């Protein structure tokens, strides 16, 4: 309400009055009586008293204000009783579709003459085509996984860095403890991106996976060394080391299954939601087919006059909804004990 | 003190015939069994957004009587691990809890703490654990419970911590619930839950076709506001990037 | 003519070579034939005649509307309409200019928008207002004399 001399005490001037907890609600017989104390002066605290005697017939819809003091207007708040249907709310189903078209990817080939096969079988005893099949079969296999990293690079940038939460390996200038235990704080930027994604997408059935460089993902388990007798014959050429590439983690926030791979660049982790509900779909890889053309049929593009092998890989990867976050790990080069 | 429960808004779904013949044939989906479960979930979120507008309104009536800020950023000469600085939030809760039991003289109150699950994660500060990351066994949040519904037992109170993502991140909210039935702080009154399958009721937009109407009548009231707000500052996860 | 769906108006002006956000339920008697924003257009919409700038009727010997003989633009999937249309330009001296029209329309918003890749004057659509929502129908009534 606003009298002829009132201060807002929110935008303090000659304005309204907040009726904090002394509102005038509708009593019996649909009347409104309230003895209220409005402020008048901010530096004076005059607190002029007044009263608002009011009645309104509800079905007759007319109000009736009187007041002993001096009124200018009253800001009211009520609704229309929705007994007689005049305004209800409707709900309807809408349905659209999204296409998962798969297409012909690039086929790789290996031009193979005849007088180069006997030249390798004679001198070096090199099989010319079993060193070219596995050359092709490793090129197509790494073409897939380099595309996956390209897929998660571009289809994170279309989220406009909604979950870009950074991290420093250099502790703060007033930390003053061991920087080995500062790497435990990586787990609270991981669990902070995780809970930030279950709040803007409302899903609770995740299997949040982390892909990252084995330099960067090494800070997550933060494991310590063990020592034994250095016998020179019983050395183990990386016999038990698997926790820098494939490790399971179970926080209090959500569960995890991290992935360490040297193909991604050092300096950034990447969180990906995977839900167990078959209805919801975050990211999906669709491998269509993969077949080898053994020599006959297809020609060559660089030099068509000689026979050649042929191999192609048909696949695509799609993003239905992009729940993907990036943790920028900063100053991780092992130079913390040099500054 | 009066309590009035008024008629609320009707939720109703228009259902023609050809919309049911097409969706059953083209996609095998029902417009009478999916619009109904949609009508229920829309009505079930009015009663959980009214409460958030209620406690935001009721805290504004007290003019910030119990307003105790917490800083996730540690102080400029704290100089230890910033994980255990978040054990300070356990005693900003208990400092404003005992501030309630001192003014309102309560000695039998169970407290409840509602807040964002990003913000209430700081209460247990549970550390990680590790195992083998095999694809054959993926536990899709099998044991995850303590970020939405947590129990507590301090030396100053018991708590029944509630985490839901509908409330905005940045602040906590502590409500006093006394088991003594004479004293009452915040009571929720569900009056009725009425649903009709047409039943003579028409539609507002297109009256010529049948519709399934439903509504629920309810209100929630505050006799005396015992509510506090812990302003958690700088919880954007940038405590390590600074 | 007695029992049937409510036919929309035919003549659409697509001057300037294109039209955008054209209301398709214009000309109808609002209230008992159609209710705008309540009932939709049916998915039987198709164009039976068109008229470019330099066209030929080939029913009369004048530059008029061109009949689309078995190359009408039906409502295709996702409510869009494309068509590679060849039309006669003159009479005996058939120059036969070609022009593609491709377009979309929303059933819910009764809103068409047409764009040709050349020059176009107007078009003659043919569609029915949908009877999914009970807007208007036919009523049988018994009568008796002696």
């Amino acid at each position: 309400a606003k009298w002829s001399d009132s201060f807002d005490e929110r935008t303090s001037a000659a304005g309204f009055v907040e009726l904090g907890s002394n509102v005038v609600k509708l009593q019996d017989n649909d009347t409104l009586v309230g003895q209220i104390k409005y402020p008048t002066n901010g530096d004076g605290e005059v607190e002029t008293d007044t009263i608002l005697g009011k009645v309104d017939v509800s079905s007759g819809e007319l109000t009736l204000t009187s007041a002993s003091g001096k009124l200018t207007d009253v800001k009211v708040k009520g609704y229309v009783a929705s007994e007689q249907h005049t305004s209800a709310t409707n709900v309807e189903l809408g349905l659209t579709r999204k296409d998962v078209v798969i297409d012909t990817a690039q086929h790789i080939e290996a031009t193979v003459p005849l007088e180069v096969i006997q030249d390798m079988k004679a001198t070096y005893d090199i099989d010319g085509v079993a060193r070219l099949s596995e050359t092709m079969s490793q090129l197509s296999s790494q073409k897939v996984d380099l595309d996956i990293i390209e897929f998660l690079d571009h289809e994170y940038k279309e989220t406009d860095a909604k979950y870009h939460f950074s991290f420093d390996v250099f502790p703060h200038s007033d930390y003053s403890a061991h920087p080995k235990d500062w790497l435990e704080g990586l787990r609270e930027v991981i669990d902070h991106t995780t809970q930030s994604m279950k709040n803007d997408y409302k899903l609770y059935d995740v299997q949040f996976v982390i892909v990252g460089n084995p330099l960067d993902v090494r800070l997550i388990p933060n494991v310590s060394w063990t020592f034994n007798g250095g016998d020179r014959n019983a050395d183990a050429y990386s016999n038990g080391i698997k926790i820098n590439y494939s490790l399971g983690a179970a926080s209090g926030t959500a569960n995890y299954r991290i992935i360490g791979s040297d193909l991604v660049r050092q300096g950034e982790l990447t969180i990906i939601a995977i839900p167990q509900q078959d209805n919801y779909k975050t990211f999906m890889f669709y491998p269509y087919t993969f077949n080898v053309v053994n020599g006959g049929g297809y020609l060559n593009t660089r030099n068509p006059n000689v026979p050649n092998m042929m191999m192609t890989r048909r696949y695509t990867v799609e993003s239905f909804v992009p729940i993907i976050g990036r943790i920028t790990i900063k100053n991780n080069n092992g130079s913390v004990y040099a500054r | 003190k009066d309590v009035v429960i008024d008629t609320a808004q009707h939720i109703e779904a228009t259902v023609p015939l050809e919309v049911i013949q097409d969706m059953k044939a083209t996609y095998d989906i029902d417009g009478v069994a999916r619009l109904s479960e949609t009508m229920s979930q829309l009505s079930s979120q009015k009663v959980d957004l009214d409460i958030i507008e209620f406690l935001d309104h009721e805290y504004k009536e007290t003019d910030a009587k119990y307003h105790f800020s917490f800083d996730v950023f540690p102080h400029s000469d704290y100089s230890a691990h910033p994980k255990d600085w978040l054990e300070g939030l356990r005693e900003v809760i208990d400092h404003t809890t005992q501030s309630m039991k001192n003014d309102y003289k309560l000695y039998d109150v169970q407290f409840v703490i509602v807040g964002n699950p990003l913000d209430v994660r700081l209460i247990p500060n549970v550390s990680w654990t590790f195992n083998g990351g095999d694809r054959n066994a993926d536990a899709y949040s099998n044991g995850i419970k303590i970020n939405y519904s947590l129990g507590a037992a301090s030396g100053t109170a018991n708590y029944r911590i509630i985490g839901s993502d509908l409330v905005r991140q940045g602040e906590l909210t502590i409500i006093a619930i006394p088991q003594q039935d004479n004293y009452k702080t915040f009571m929720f009154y569900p009056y009725t839950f009425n649903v009709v399958n047409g039943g003579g009721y028409l539609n507002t937009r297109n009256p010529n076709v049948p519709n399934m109407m439903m509504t629920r009548r309810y209100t929630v009231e505050s006799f005396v506001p015992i509510i506090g707000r812990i302003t958690i500052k700088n919880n954007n996860g940038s405590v390590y990037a600074r | 003519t007695l029992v049937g769906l409510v036919q929309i108006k035919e003549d659409i002006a697509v001057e300037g070579g294109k039209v955008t956000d054209y209301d398709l339920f214009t000309g109808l008697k609002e209230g008992k034939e159609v209710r705008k924003g309540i009932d939709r257009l049916d998915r039987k919409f198709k164009i039976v005649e068109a008229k470019w700038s330099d066209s030929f009727d080939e029913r009369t010997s004048a530059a008029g509307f061109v009949e689309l003989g078995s190359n009408v633009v039906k409502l295709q999937d996702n409510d869009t309409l494309v068509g590679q249309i060849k039309y006669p330009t003159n009479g005996d001296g058939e120059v036969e200019t070609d022009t593609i029209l491709g377009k979309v329309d929303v059933s819910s918003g009764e809103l068409t928008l047409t764009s040709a890749s050349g020059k176009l004057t107007d078009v003659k659509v043919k569609g029915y207002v949908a009877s999914e929502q009970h807007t208007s129908a036919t009523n049988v009534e018994l009568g008796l004399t002696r």
Binding site: - | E18 | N78, S107
Partner: peptide, 18 residues
Amino acid sequence: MGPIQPYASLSMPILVKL
């Protein structure tokens, strides 16, 4: 319905020319 996207399914015979 209007805002529901129509899916034209595929009937079985392939209608070869003569």
